[PDB]
Amino acid sequence: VYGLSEDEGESRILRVKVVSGIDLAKKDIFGASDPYVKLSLYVADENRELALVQTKTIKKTLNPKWNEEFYFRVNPSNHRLLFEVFDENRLTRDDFLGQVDVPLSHLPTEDPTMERPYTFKDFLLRPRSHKSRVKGFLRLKMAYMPKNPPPPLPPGWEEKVDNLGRTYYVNHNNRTTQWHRPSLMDVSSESDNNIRQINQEAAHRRFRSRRHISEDLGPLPPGWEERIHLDGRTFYIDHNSKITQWEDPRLQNPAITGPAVPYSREFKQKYDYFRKKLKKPADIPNRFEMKLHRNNIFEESYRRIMSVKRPDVLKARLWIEFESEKGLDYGGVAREWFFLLSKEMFNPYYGLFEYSATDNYTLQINPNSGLCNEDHLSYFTFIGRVAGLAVFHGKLLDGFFIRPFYKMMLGKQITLNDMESVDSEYYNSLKWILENDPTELDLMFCIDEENFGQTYQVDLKPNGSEIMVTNENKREYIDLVIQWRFVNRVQKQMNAFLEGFTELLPIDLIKIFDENELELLMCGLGDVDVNDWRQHSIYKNGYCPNHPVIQWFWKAVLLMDAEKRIRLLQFVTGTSRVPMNGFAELYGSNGPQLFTIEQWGSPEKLPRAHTCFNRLDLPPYETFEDLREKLLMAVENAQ
């Protein structure tokens, strides 16, 4: 009698009532028990949607107390019910918690409000796809008193589920991986094969569009560099912590606390000092010549660039000769070689790298790389050597990465703000544990791992399975979870890559930068179209497009330099590149989502960022000076 009935006519009033669920399935280690039930009352003939209801009253609890009743007027002659339970905290994974199909054919003697059945019949959850597991029963009650097979795929195609939980289709016919469904009949006479041709041609102009930073007793501790002040002054500063000093830090301890210049982070001078310090000592052959075939560019290279006895030969000038090519070698053929080798290497097909979780156009080391290839060590050393050579010769490498990758390459610790860019679900669960009391989760020091079809349990610490988590120790629990999830899984391959990188460059010369700068150093500095950026940025919570705060923000953004604008873009969206089509395809954790500005925080606080949703939380500001100062401070301190 409350409502929710839009059929009328010759129909019968029936009440459904869900009660609860017992022992619901989950694959998230933590559990992520945040389900919601969708009731779909329809007709068994055409399966057209007639009544759709959704309820969500239980969060962070495996057994939901969903004692919910719904009244609808339909004829039970040819009607059916579907109960689809999903999970709102299983992003990037199959959230299909389960499905149950209820036929309206039995029709027992039901007398609501005039009977004491006390039955609450249980029905087993039924899976819908092979990529789904169901456990437990759903309790239902019915009342009616008143009256009067995956689709086939083309040959060479196969579907895989990466460790994140998403799915992607890989084709062996052309050795290429993609996200959408496998292509239909190839009929690649000229148009379909030209699509790959124009894609390469379009992407190749993009690579040449980006430009490097330069073209825009004796050692020092890492992170310390020299700068020149006016009136002919020399002062050494530390980029590890914002410290500026006059006398040299080496053994000059008594001479400290002087009127040093205010701290400033300048990239051009930093790269200038870096390239000044790096040198090739001793002797080396003056012509490092290689010959390559296009179709085997990745393969043949691995038998030469790695088979070298010593890395010093790499420091020499590079010379490349392509098959059936006799063009000039004015440092452009090497650039095209670097671009093509990079585009071939950074492919998920080989399994070395897989796409990240915060976006879908960046790459990270695959923790499951051992299964896909038996010799990931050698290929990772090869890629490290290629990256080292690219940085040494000053060329540009078209391979991007997430922040924690560079953070580990600099030998820095890992926190939740790093893990947010490797997997959204773990970050959300860990942040919920840190902010709230973990007693509700009631999860002890146990990790459930399934291998070879059998599932076992492991402990982070000895006697972990016999100690429950509580307050005042969640810090070590989340730290060990981070170690088991990200740091320890990929430490060996990352160490191999780091050794390959440092075999060609000194490793004390890279700690001077930070995690936001190596990406620009290796991939080059791009260009951002500010106008198209402005036309494709939504605002909410009262920030009008012509609201004063948004006007000041856009004025400041168009007022900043290219390097700081790039740093702001990297600080917001977690990647210093934009899609080649434009700013309209800026993907996020849960699908595409444009640049967004949010009204949040106190006026005297720095703006925050959210790379998962590509959002910038900016408190309102009084005048232009305050906004420029705060935004510049936040961008310079982007961490």
Side-chain angles (χ1 to χ4, degrees):
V1 299
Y2 72 100
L4 220 174
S5 296
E6 302 296 333
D7 198 332
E8 299 180 358
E10 299 183 4
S11 298
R12 314 303 181 275
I13 164 181
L14 280 75
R15 171 214 295 182
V16 312
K17 194 172 183 179
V18 291
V19 182
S20 290
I22 299 301
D23 194 5
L24 281 312
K26 48 92 193 175
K27 260 286 186 175
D28 205 2
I29 304 177
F30 299 98
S33 57
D34 184 62
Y36 75 92
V37 51
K38 180 193 303 182
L39 148 69
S40 301
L41 166 55
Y42 65 104
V43 49
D45 188 13
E46 213 272 339
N47 303 334
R48 59 184 180 182
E49 184 68 21
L50 306 179
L52 197 154
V53 180
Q54 289 186 359
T55 54
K56 171 192 175 179
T57 54
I58 291 300
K59 182 176 302 178
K60 291 302 177 299
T61 299
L62 185 55
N63 309 85
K65 276 69 58 182
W66 294 345
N67 180 86
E68 320 303 323
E69 63 284 350
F70 311 106
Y71 299 77
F72 208 95
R73 38 183 59 182
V74 286
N75 54 321
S77 178
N78 196 18
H79 284 238
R80 215 173 179 98
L81 296 171
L82 276 179
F83 299 151
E84 292 90 334
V85 282
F86 305 104
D87 190 61
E88 290 180 6
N89 280 122
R90 200 161 293 187
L91 183 59
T92 70
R93 292 183 176 91
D94 291 324
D95 65 82
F96 200 103
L97 190 65
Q99 185 177 177
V100 169
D101 194 4
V102 181
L104 282 71
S105 300
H106 48 285
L107 307 181
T109 60
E110 305 163 338
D111 304 72
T113 326
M114 302 297 176
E115 200 181 1
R116 43 169 64 178
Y118 305 148
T119 299
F120 320 102
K121 190 183 63 60
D122 300 6
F123 208 175
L124 172 61
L125 270 295
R126 199 62 178 181
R128 194 59 177 180
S129 179
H130 50 69
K131 302 298 182 180
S132 57
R133 303 300 298 108
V134 290
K135 291 173 57 60
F137 294 150
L138 190 62
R139 301 188 177 181
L140 317 170
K141 181 180 178 299
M142 201 60 174
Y144 164 66
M145 192 173 184
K147 51 182 56 182
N148 295 330
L153 308 189
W157 290 89
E158 191 266 0
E159 64 282 6
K160 289 175 184 177
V161 174
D162 50 359
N163 190 86
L164 265 303
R166 306 181 307 266
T167 174
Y168 66 97
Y169 296 91
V170 46
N171 182 21
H172 306 68
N173 305 333
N174 41 19
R175 314 197 306 109
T176 310
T177 68
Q178 59 184 21
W179 294 77
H180 58 282
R181 284 290 296 181
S183 177
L184 287 315
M185 293 59 65
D186 195 7
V187 74
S188 61
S189 58
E190 57 277 347
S191 302
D192 182 72
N193 49 88
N194 183 269
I195 291 302
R196 302 187 300 268
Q197 181 70 19
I198 186 181
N199 188 83
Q200 293 189 198
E201 176 62 29
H204 205 282
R205 291 189 297 101
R206 175 59 55 84
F207 179 82
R208 280 199 175 101
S209 62
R210 309 180 308 189
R211 34 186 158 81
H212 207 185
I213 295 293
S214 184
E215 296 165 333
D216 189 69
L217 188 144
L220 294 177
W224 294 85
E225 67 172 349
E226 179 272 349
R227 200 75 74 213
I228 294 182
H229 176 267
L230 291 80
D231 302 4
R233 302 300 296 271
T234 281
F235 61 96
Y236 303 93
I237 59 180
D238 190 357
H239 289 356
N240 292 324
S241 177
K242 320 300 175 297
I243 303 180
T244 61
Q245 293 175 340
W246 271 106
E247 282 73 9
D248 191 65
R250 297 172 294 187
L251 94 104
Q252 312 301 330
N253 185 25
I256 203 180
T257 65
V261 312
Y263 187 91
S264 61
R265 191 268 320 177
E266 52 279 16
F267 196 98
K268 298 193 307 298
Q269 289 77 3
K270 216 177 304 183
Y271 179 85
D272 189 11
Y273 179 75
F274 173 83
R275 64 182 292 268
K276 187 69 57 56
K277 187 53 63 186
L278 172 57
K279 279 292 181 299
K280 185 221 69 176
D283 66 328
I284 214 55
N286 301 329
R287 181 173 179 83
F288 176 73
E289 179 181 2
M290 201 181 313
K291 168 173 288 299
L292 261 73
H293 296 178
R294 319 294 278 263
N295 52 333
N296 296 18
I297 267 188
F298 170 75
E299 306 283 52
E300 199 80 4
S301 302
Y302 174 70
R303 281 166 293 182
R304 180 53 184 258
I305 194 71
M306 175 52 60
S307 175
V308 64
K309 175 57 183 179
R310 56 180 180 271
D312 293 1
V313 189
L314 307 173
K315 289 183 180 299
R317 56 180 305 187
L318 184 143
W319 201 280
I320 183 68
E321 293 295 330
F322 300 94
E323 193 179 19
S324 179
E325 174 66 23
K326 292 192 62 179
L328 197 55
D329 295 356
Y330 52 99
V333 290
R335 206 173 306 267
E336 184 268 349
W337 168 89
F338 259 119
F339 160 72
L340 195 35
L341 189 59
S342 175
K343 189 165 63 177
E344 187 74 22
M345 282 160 43
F346 295 93
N347 274 332
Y349 183 31
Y350 291 154
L352 304 183
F353 303 89
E354 71 180 5
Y355 293 105
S356 174
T358 175
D359 296 310
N360 56 11
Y361 49 89
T362 58
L363 299 91
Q364 69 161 355
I365 307 179
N366 189 10
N368 203 26
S369 56
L371 300 184
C372 68
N373 296 265
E374 81 299 331
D375 194 6
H376 62 70
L377 161 74
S378 186
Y379 287 162
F380 266 92
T381 54
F382 154 91
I383 297 183
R385 277 186 181 176
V386 149
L389 194 47
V391 180
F392 184 92
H393 282 174
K395 311 302 180 181
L396 302 177
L397 208 166
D398 186 10
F400 284 100
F401 285 102
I402 48 181
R403 305 266 56 82
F405 178 79
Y406 298 100
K407 190 163 295 184
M408 281 185 294
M409 187 156 53
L410 295 186
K412 296 167 57 63
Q413 54 184 357
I414 308 298
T415 55
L416 291 76
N417 314 129
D418 309 324
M419 181 164 291
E420 78 174 7
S421 299
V422 179
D423 33 6
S424 180
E425 290 300 335
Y426 285 92
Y427 170 74
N428 288 264
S429 299
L430 289 176
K431 173 146 291 181
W432 193 93
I433 287 186
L434 179 57
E435 296 186 10
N436 204 324
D437 192 57
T439 310
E440 300 176 357
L441 287 185
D442 195 6
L443 195 138
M444 53 187 64
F445 286 75
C446 303
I447 300 298
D448 304 318
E449 174 70 19
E450 180 181 15
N451 305 122
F452 305 95
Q454 49 87 11
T455 307
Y456 273 153
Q457 172 187 343
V458 297
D459 304 338
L460 294 319
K461 66 174 68 176
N463 296 84
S465 180
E466 297 173 330
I467 167 66
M468 69 297 296
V469 74
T470 175
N471 64 89
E472 86 187 355
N473 59 21
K474 53 183 179 179
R475 272 298 311 181
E476 71 170 5
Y477 170 69
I478 64 180
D479 176 68
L480 290 184
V481 167
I482 289 178
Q483 293 296 322
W484 179 92
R485 177 57 181 87
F486 193 24
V487 179
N488 192 25
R489 294 257 296 182
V490 307
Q491 188 198 13
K492 178 176 176 56
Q493 35 217 344
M494 183 56 174
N495 176 270
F497 173 80
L498 180 61
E499 182 183 9
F501 182 88
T502 194
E503 193 176 359
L504 201 43
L505 301 180
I507 202 181
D508 73 323
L509 309 184
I510 312 299
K511 300 205 63 178
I512 177 181
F513 309 147
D514 64 355
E515 67 282 358
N516 280 325
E517 284 165 337
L518 261 66
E519 177 176 349
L520 300 187
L521 173 63
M522 296 197 313
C523 314
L525 175 129
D527 57 331
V528 171
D529 195 10
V530 55
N531 301 14
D532 185 69
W533 192 4
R534 187 208 304 260
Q535 299 298 332
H536 290 59
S537 302
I538 67 180
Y539 317 94
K540 42 197 302 181
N541 284 15
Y543 284 169
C544 304
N546 204 26
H547 199 280
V549 292
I550 296 304
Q551 181 185 200
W552 303 130
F553 168 81
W554 278 123
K555 192 60 61 57
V557 163
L558 72 92
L559 192 62
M560 289 190 301
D561 201 321
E563 204 287 324
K564 292 186 175 304
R565 189 181 311 177
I566 285 292
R567 193 181 188 101
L568 184 144
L569 175 57
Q570 175 186 176
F571 152 83
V572 175
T573 194
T575 296
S576 66
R577 94 184 198 97
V578 294
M580 55 176 57
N581 195 17
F583 273 92
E585 300 179 356
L586 197 62
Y587 278 100
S589 298
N590 49 21
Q593 186 173 359
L594 307 89
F595 207 91
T596 306
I597 297 191
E598 184 74 15
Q599 186 184 210
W600 172 96
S602 176
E604 289 81 351
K605 296 182 180 181
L606 290 77
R608 296 278 79 173
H610 289 270
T611 68
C612 292
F613 305 144
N614 306 92
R615 302 190 310 103
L616 182 69
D617 298 0
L618 180 76
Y621 288 101
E622 294 75 8
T623 187
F624 186 81
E625 173 77 12
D626 194 10
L627 179 52
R628 186 178 62 180
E629 185 181 23
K630 259 57 179 182
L631 200 65
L632 262 301
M633 180 180 299
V635 171
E636 180 181 2
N637 201 15
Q639 176 183 172

PDB file of all heavy atoms in Angstrom, residues 623-638:
ATOM      1  N   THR A 623      41.515  36.394  -2.935  1.00  0.00           N
ATOM      2  CA  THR A 623      42.024  37.145  -4.075  1.00  0.00           C
ATOM      3  C   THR A 623      42.981  36.278  -4.883  1.00  0.00           C
ATOM      4  O   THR A 623      43.283  35.137  -4.524  1.00  0.00           O
ATOM      5  CB  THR A 623      42.730  38.432  -3.632  1.00  0.00           C
ATOM      6  OG1 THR A 623      43.059  39.213  -4.787  1.00  0.00           O
ATOM      7  CG2 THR A 623      44.006  38.100  -2.882  1.00  0.00           C
ATOM      8  N   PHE A 624      43.466  36.850  -5.986  1.00  0.00           N
ATOM      9  CA  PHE A 624      44.336  36.115  -6.897  1.00  0.00           C
ATOM     10  C   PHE A 624      45.658  35.751  -6.234  1.00  0.00           C
ATOM     11  O   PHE A 624      46.200  34.666  -6.477  1.00  0.00           O
ATOM     12  CB  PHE A 624      44.575  36.941  -8.160  1.00  0.00           C
ATOM     13  CG  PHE A 624      45.352  36.222  -9.223  1.00  0.00           C
ATOM     14  CD1 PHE A 624      44.724  35.330 -10.070  1.00  0.00           C
ATOM     15  CD2 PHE A 624      46.705  36.449  -9.381  1.00  0.00           C
ATOM     16  CE1 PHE A 624      45.431  34.672 -11.050  1.00  0.00           C
ATOM     17  CE2 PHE A 624      47.418  35.794 -10.358  1.00  0.00           C
ATOM     18  CZ  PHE A 624      46.780  34.904 -11.194  1.00  0.00           C
ATOM     19  N   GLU A 625      46.197  36.648  -5.406  1.00  0.00           N
ATOM     20  CA  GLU A 625      47.493  36.397  -4.784  1.00  0.00           C
ATOM     21  C   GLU A 625      47.451  35.144  -3.920  1.00  0.00           C
ATOM     22  O   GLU A 625      48.349  34.295  -3.989  1.00  0.00           O
ATOM     23  CB  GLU A 625      47.914  37.610  -3.953  1.00  0.00           C
ATOM     24  CG  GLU A 625      49.176  37.403  -3.129  1.00  0.00           C
ATOM     25  CD  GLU A 625      50.441  37.470  -3.961  1.00  0.00           C
ATOM     26  OE1 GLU A 625      50.366  37.906  -5.129  1.00  0.00           O
ATOM     27  OE2 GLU A 625      51.512  37.090  -3.445  1.00  0.00           O
ATOM     28  N   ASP A 626      46.403  35.009  -3.108  1.00  0.00           N
ATOM     29  CA  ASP A 626      46.300  33.854  -2.226  1.00  0.00           C
ATOM     30  C   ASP A 626      46.197  32.562  -3.024  1.00  0.00           C
ATOM     31  O   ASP A 626      46.862  31.570  -2.700  1.00  0.00           O
ATOM     32  CB  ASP A 626      45.096  34.013  -1.298  1.00  0.00           C
ATOM     33  CG  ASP A 626      45.123  33.042  -0.136  1.00  0.00           C
ATOM     34  OD1 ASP A 626      46.161  32.379   0.062  1.00  0.00           O
ATOM     35  OD2 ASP A 626      44.104  32.943   0.580  1.00  0.00           O
ATOM     36  N   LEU A 627      45.375  32.554  -4.078  1.00  0.00           N
ATOM     37  CA  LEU A 627      45.220  31.340  -4.870  1.00  0.00           C
ATOM     38  C   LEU A 627      46.514  30.974  -5.576  1.00  0.00           C
ATOM     39  O   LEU A 627      46.898  29.800  -5.602  1.00  0.00           O
ATOM     40  CB  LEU A 627      44.090  31.493  -5.884  1.00  0.00           C
ATOM     41  CG  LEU A 627      43.894  30.262  -6.773  1.00  0.00           C
ATOM     42  CD1 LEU A 627      43.769  29.007  -5.935  1.00  0.00           C
ATOM     43  CD2 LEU A 627      42.671  30.417  -7.636  1.00  0.00           C
ATOM     44  N   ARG A 628      47.203  31.957  -6.156  1.00  0.00           N
ATOM     45  CA  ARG A 628      48.458  31.656  -6.833  1.00  0.00           C
ATOM     46  C   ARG A 628      49.483  31.104  -5.851  1.00  0.00           C
ATOM     47  O   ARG A 628      50.152  30.104  -6.136  1.00  0.00           O
ATOM     48  CB  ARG A 628      49.001  32.897  -7.538  1.00  0.00           C
ATOM     49  CG  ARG A 628      50.235  32.615  -8.383  1.00  0.00           C
ATOM     50  CD  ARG A 628      50.710  33.855  -9.114  1.00  0.00           C
ATOM     51  NE  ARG A 628      51.107  34.908  -8.190  1.00  0.00           N
ATOM     52  CZ  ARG A 628      51.555  36.098  -8.563  1.00  0.00           C
ATOM     53  NH1 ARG A 628      51.678  36.421  -9.839  1.00  0.00           N
ATOM     54  NH2 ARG A 628      51.887  36.988  -7.632  1.00  0.00           N
ATOM     55  N   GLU A 629      49.599  31.726  -4.675  1.00  0.00           N
ATOM     56  CA  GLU A 629      50.571  31.261  -3.690  1.00  0.00           C
ATOM     57  C   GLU A 629      50.254  29.844  -3.227  1.00  0.00           C
ATOM     58  O   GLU A 629      51.138  28.980  -3.186  1.00  0.00           O
ATOM     59  CB  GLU A 629      50.607  32.220  -2.500  1.00  0.00           C
ATOM     60  CG  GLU A 629      51.668  31.892  -1.470  1.00  0.00           C
ATOM     61  CD  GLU A 629      51.654  32.860  -0.304  1.00  0.00           C
ATOM     62  OE1 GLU A 629      50.601  33.488  -0.066  1.00  0.00           O
ATOM     63  OE2 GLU A 629      52.696  32.994   0.372  1.00  0.00           O
ATOM     64  N   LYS A 630      48.989  29.582  -2.890  1.00  0.00           N
ATOM     65  CA  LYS A 630      48.621  28.260  -2.399  1.00  0.00           C
ATOM     66  C   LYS A 630      48.794  27.194  -3.473  1.00  0.00           C
ATOM     67  O   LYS A 630      49.322  26.110  -3.196  1.00  0.00           O
ATOM     68  CB  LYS A 630      47.186  28.273  -1.880  1.00  0.00           C
ATOM     69  CG  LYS A 630      47.086  28.364  -0.368  1.00  0.00           C
ATOM     70  CD  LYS A 630      47.809  29.584   0.173  1.00  0.00           C
ATOM     71  CE  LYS A 630      47.682  29.672   1.687  1.00  0.00           C
ATOM     72  NZ  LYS A 630      48.340  30.889   2.234  1.00  0.00           N
ATOM     73  N   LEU A 631      48.359  27.476  -4.703  1.00  0.00           N
ATOM     74  CA  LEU A 631      48.490  26.489  -5.769  1.00  0.00           C
ATOM     75  C   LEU A 631      49.952  26.219  -6.092  1.00  0.00           C
ATOM     76  O   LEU A 631      50.338  25.068  -6.321  1.00  0.00           O
ATOM     77  CB  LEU A 631      47.741  26.954  -7.016  1.00  0.00           C
ATOM     78  CG  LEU A 631      47.389  25.845  -8.004  1.00  0.00           C
ATOM     79  CD1 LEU A 631      46.417  24.879  -7.363  1.00  0.00           C
ATOM     80  CD2 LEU A 631      46.808  26.423  -9.275  1.00  0.00           C
ATOM     81  N   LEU A 632      50.783  27.265  -6.120  1.00  0.00           N
ATOM     82  CA  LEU A 632      52.204  27.065  -6.372  1.00  0.00           C
ATOM     83  C   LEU A 632      52.846  26.241  -5.265  1.00  0.00           C
ATOM     84  O   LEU A 632      53.669  25.362  -5.540  1.00  0.00           O
ATOM     85  CB  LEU A 632      52.906  28.411  -6.520  1.00  0.00           C
ATOM     86  CG  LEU A 632      53.128  28.860  -7.961  1.00  0.00           C
ATOM     87  CD1 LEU A 632      53.970  27.834  -8.690  1.00  0.00           C
ATOM     88  CD2 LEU A 632      51.810  29.070  -8.679  1.00  0.00           C
ATOM     89  N   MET A 633      52.482  26.507  -4.008  1.00  0.00           N
ATOM     90  CA  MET A 633      53.024  25.715  -2.910  1.00  0.00           C
ATOM     91  C   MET A 633      52.603  24.256  -3.026  1.00  0.00           C
ATOM     92  O   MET A 633      53.419  23.349  -2.822  1.00  0.00           O
ATOM     93  CB  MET A 633      52.578  26.296  -1.569  1.00  0.00           C
ATOM     94  CG  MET A 633      53.103  25.538  -0.364  1.00  0.00           C
ATOM     95  SD  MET A 633      52.556  26.247   1.200  1.00  0.00           S
ATOM     96  CE  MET A 633      53.260  27.889   1.093  1.00  0.00           C
ATOM     97  N   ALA A 634      51.336  24.011  -3.365  1.00  0.00           N
ATOM     98  CA  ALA A 634      50.861  22.637  -3.493  1.00  0.00           C
ATOM     99  C   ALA A 634      51.554  21.908  -4.638  1.00  0.00           C
ATOM    100  O   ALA A 634      51.918  20.734  -4.504  1.00  0.00           O
ATOM    101  CB  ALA A 634      49.347  22.619  -3.688  1.00  0.00           C
ATOM    102  N   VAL A 635      51.740  22.584  -5.773  1.00  0.00           N
ATOM    103  CA  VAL A 635      52.378  21.941  -6.919  1.00  0.00           C
ATOM    104  C   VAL A 635      53.852  21.673  -6.639  1.00  0.00           C
ATOM    105  O   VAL A 635      54.365  20.588  -6.938  1.00  0.00           O
ATOM    106  CB  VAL A 635      52.186  22.790  -8.185  1.00  0.00           C
ATOM    107  CG1 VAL A 635      53.035  22.245  -9.316  1.00  0.00           C
ATOM    108  CG2 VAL A 635      50.725  22.802  -8.582  1.00  0.00           C
ATOM    109  N   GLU A 636      54.560  22.651  -6.067  1.00  0.00           N
ATOM    110  CA  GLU A 636      55.961  22.439  -5.723  1.00  0.00           C
ATOM    111  C   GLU A 636      56.118  21.344  -4.677  1.00  0.00           C
ATOM    112  O   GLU A 636      57.117  20.617  -4.681  1.00  0.00           O
ATOM    113  CB  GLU A 636      56.577  23.745  -5.228  1.00  0.00           C
ATOM    114  CG  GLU A 636      58.036  23.645  -4.835  1.00  0.00           C
ATOM    115  CD  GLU A 636      58.589  24.963  -4.335  1.00  0.00           C
ATOM    116  OE1 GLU A 636      57.820  25.944  -4.269  1.00  0.00           O
ATOM    117  OE2 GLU A 636      59.793  25.018  -4.008  1.00  0.00           O
ATOM    118  N   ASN A 637      55.143  21.204  -3.782  1.00  0.00           N
ATOM    119  CA  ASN A 637      55.156  20.164  -2.757  1.00  0.00           C
ATOM    120  C   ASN A 637      54.207  19.027  -3.105  1.00  0.00           C
ATOM    121  O   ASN A 637      53.525  18.481  -2.234  1.00  0.00           O
ATOM    122  CB  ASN A 637      54.809  20.765  -1.397  1.00  0.00           C
ATOM    123  CG  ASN A 637      55.292  19.913  -0.242  1.00  0.00           C
ATOM    124  OD1 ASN A 637      56.113  19.014  -0.418  1.00  0.00           O
ATOM    125  ND2 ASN A 637      54.788  20.198   0.953  1.00  0.00           N
ATOM    126  N   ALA A 638      54.138  18.653  -4.381  1.00  0.00           N
ATOM    127  CA  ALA A 638      53.222  17.611  -4.836  1.00  0.00           C
ATOM    128  C   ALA A 638      53.714  16.261  -4.338  1.00  0.00           C
ATOM    129  O   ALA A 638      54.631  15.668  -4.909  1.00  0.00           O
ATOM    130  CB  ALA A 638      53.110  17.624  -6.355  1.00  0.00           C
TER     131      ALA A 638
END
